[PDB]
Structures are given as structure tokens and as C-alpha cells.
């Protein structure tokens, strides 16, 4: 959306967003130190957030916490006959998610490419135009240091497999963040090295205890989470160094990361996304998918597989449309030197 000069950057000369209030920078420095000490005083928890602890907290949250027993009879629009069969799943006052519209000032229109490059030719096959979508302004950088923020509601992201959260700071500014499995409307978060080891809290890798479940880990200092963002994904702390932190990713891969980078504590929301079963091809049609035609039912010129008839068999290895093997054939530059990768 934005210009290349406005979006492209290699080197970063800052890792925080400063919003001073005093007339002079000398006073602002003292104010920042006071805020940091205030957050340090409040911080109390330092134990690692393990899977077992996560489980135990989830059991408490989803066993007894939710009890209101409300009078839903009065919570409805009186005198509205409604549709002739069409009814919502649940009322807005009992739904998990917010029954509304995304913020106008935190969203924009989505440019649909249809899987086409500048040349105008089809690049990405099987790409349809489904339901209209809006790009969300997700705040990946926690620039707001030494400040608390409470959660107002949880939103749905069509573009992501996880849920979002509407964060509001004390000053009254609204921002979007990646929600968690634990976080519920009303919970408070803070981004600071002196903060406690709690869900939602963002702390450096180095400060984060060992054997701690984390997510939204950034590659470079102050760049944003790229290695793990999807729902149900998380990383683990293995080892620690004076300048490096060893992390186990979701793909069972061991890699070292800088000690200076930031990371979030917890698990991405919507853990049960891989349990839905589509009852008909209409779901795929609405999602923006297209039918896939196998190469077997193609002409020899169209596809190598064409013409040649045969079942599983063992003589002639299969060939893709591109003339390249697709079974156990590694696709990686052997010359590319391994970096911070420990175990691949």
C-alpha cells in the first residue's frame, strides 16, 4: 500500500516509541526512569510459563469463571418480527466475539491481485475472488514502553487464522494486537523488560526465563514478529548465551536469535482452527478457491503425465508440470551458508 521508500528499511536506529510530556528532555529522562521503576515495583512473577501452567489456567478459566446466569428475555429488540427462519447463532451479549464492524480508522480496502503479476499473466494458479476483505493495521511493534493497556474486545481477522484484540492505553489511544488463548476482555498487558512473566507481556529473549512458551518473536532488533504468528503456534526456549538465545520453533527446528530482540509470552489464539470440516464445495467457493485439475487428465504437451496410463507402480518417477521432481527432492541452495540455524 505504502511507498517503497516508506516501507523498506534495513537498519533501525531505534527500538522504542518515545512520547515525552515534560517541557525539557532533562525532565523527560527523569520521568521515563520513574515510569520504569514504577513498572519494576509492580512486577512480581518470574517463573516460566509452561504448558502445564497454561493448561491449569485454561481449566480454571473455562470451568468456573464464566457464570452470570442472565435474564436474556429482556435483552432483545421488542416489536421486531425478524426474518422467516434466519436467526443468528447467539445474541451479541453472549457471543465469544464482537458482533459488529471493524474500526473505520484502523482498516483499509484490500487490493485483490487475482494471482497475477505486473505482466498480467497468471502466476499463482487456483486463485479466486471470494468475499470482500479489508486490510487491518496490526501493530507488530510494541513501541509503547513502560505503559499498561487493557483489552476491550476481541475481533475476527478474515486474513488470519487467529483472533485480534482491541487494546486501549491509559492515554486513550486505540490499537490492534495479536490476541492469545488466555487473554480475555478486561485483561491488562505491558511491554517492558522489567515486566513479569505473564501472558501478553512482551520481554526480551534474554530476560525471558528458560523453558518459556513464547510467540511473535522478531528477527532483527525492533522489526516485528515474523517467525511465528499463526494460530496454535508457539516457540520454546532451549538454551541461553551472553549474546544469543536458542529457540525451538513449531517445525521442530532449533535456531539462535539475538538477545536484544523482543518477544511475547503465550500462545496465539484460536488453537482449534484445524478441526473444521467443510460440508460442501460451497465453503471453498466462498473462501476464494478454484477447482484443481490433475495433470493425469491432460494431454502429453500440456502435462508429462498425459497420455501415459498407469497405476501406482514402481519404474518411472513422477515429474511436475515444470519438469522437476516432487518427491524427496530438496529445494534449497547448498551454497547458502547456514546462519543462526543449529539443527535443521
Amino acid at each position: 500500500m505504502l511507498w517503497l521508500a516508506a516501507t523498506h528499511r534495513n537498519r533501525v536506529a531505534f527500538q522504542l516509541f518515545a512520547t515525552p510530556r515534560e517541557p525539557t528532555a532533562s525532565k523527560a529522562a527523569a520521568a521515563a526512569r520513574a515510569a520504569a521503576e514504577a513498572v519494576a515495583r509492580s512486577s512480581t512473577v518470574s517463573a516460566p510459563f509452561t504448558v502445564q501452567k497454561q493448561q491449569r489456567l485454561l481449566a480454571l478459566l473455562a470451568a468456573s469463571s464464566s457464570v452470570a446466569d442472565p435474564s436474556a428475555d429482556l435483552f432483545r429488540v421488542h416489536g421486531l418480527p425478524g426474518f422467516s427462519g434466519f436467526r443468528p447463532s447467539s445474541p451479541p451479549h453472549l457471543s465469544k466475539l464482537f458482533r459488529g464492524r471493524v474500526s473505520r480508522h484502523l482498516s483499509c480496502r484490500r487490493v485483490n491481485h487475482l494471482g497475477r503479476n505486473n505482466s498480467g499473466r497468471i502466476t499463482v494458479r487456483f486463485r479466486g475472488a471470494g468475499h470482500f476483505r479489508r486490510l487491518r493495521f496490526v501493530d507488530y511493534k510494541r513501541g509503547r514502553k513502560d505503559i499498561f493497556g487493557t483489552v476491550l474486545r476481541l475481533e475476527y481477522d478474515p486474513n488470519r487464522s487467529a483472533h485480534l484484540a482491541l487494546l486501549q492505553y491509559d492515554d486513550g489511544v486505540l490499537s490492534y494486537i495479536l490476541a492469545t488463548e488466555v487473554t480475555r476482555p478486561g485483561d491488562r498487558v505491558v511491554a517492558s523488560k522489567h515486566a513479569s512473566i505473564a501472558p501478553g507481556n512482551c520481554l526480551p529473549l534474554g530476560n525471558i526465563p528458560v523453558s518459556t512458551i513464547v510467540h511473535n518473536v522478531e528477527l532483527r532488533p525492533g522489526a516485528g514478529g515474523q517467525i511465528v504468528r499463526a494460530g496454535g503456534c508457539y516457540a520454546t526456549v532451549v538454551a541461553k548465551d551472553r549474546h544469543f538465545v536458542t529457540l525451538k520453533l513449531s517445525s521442530t527446528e532449533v535456531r539462535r536469535f539475538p538477545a536484544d530482540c523482543w518477544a511475547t509470552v503465550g500462545q496465539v489464539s484460536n488453537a482449534a482452527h484445524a478441526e473444521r470440516i467443510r460440508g460442501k464445495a460451497g465453503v471453498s467457493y466462498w473462501m476464494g478457491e478454484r477447482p484443481r485439475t490433475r495433470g493425469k487428465a491432460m494431454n502429453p504437451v500440456d502435462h508429462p503425465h498425459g497420455g501415459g496410463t498407469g497405476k501406482k507402480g514402481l519404474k518411472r518417477p513422477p515429474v511436475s508440470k515444470w519438469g522437476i521432481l516432487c518427491k524427496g527432492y530438496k529445494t534449497r541452495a547448498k551454497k547458502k551458508p547456514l546462519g543462526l540455524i543449529v539443527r535443521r
Partner: peptide, 12 residues
């Protein structure tokens, strides 16, 4: 001019 919030006084 020395106000920290004045434009051109922060590394942004």
C-alpha cells in the same frame, strides 16, 4: 524550539 515533542527532535 527545545520542546522534545517539537518536530525534528526525535529519531523518527
Amino acid at each position: 524550539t527545545y520542546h522534545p515533542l517539537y518536530p525534528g527532535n526525535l529519531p523518527k
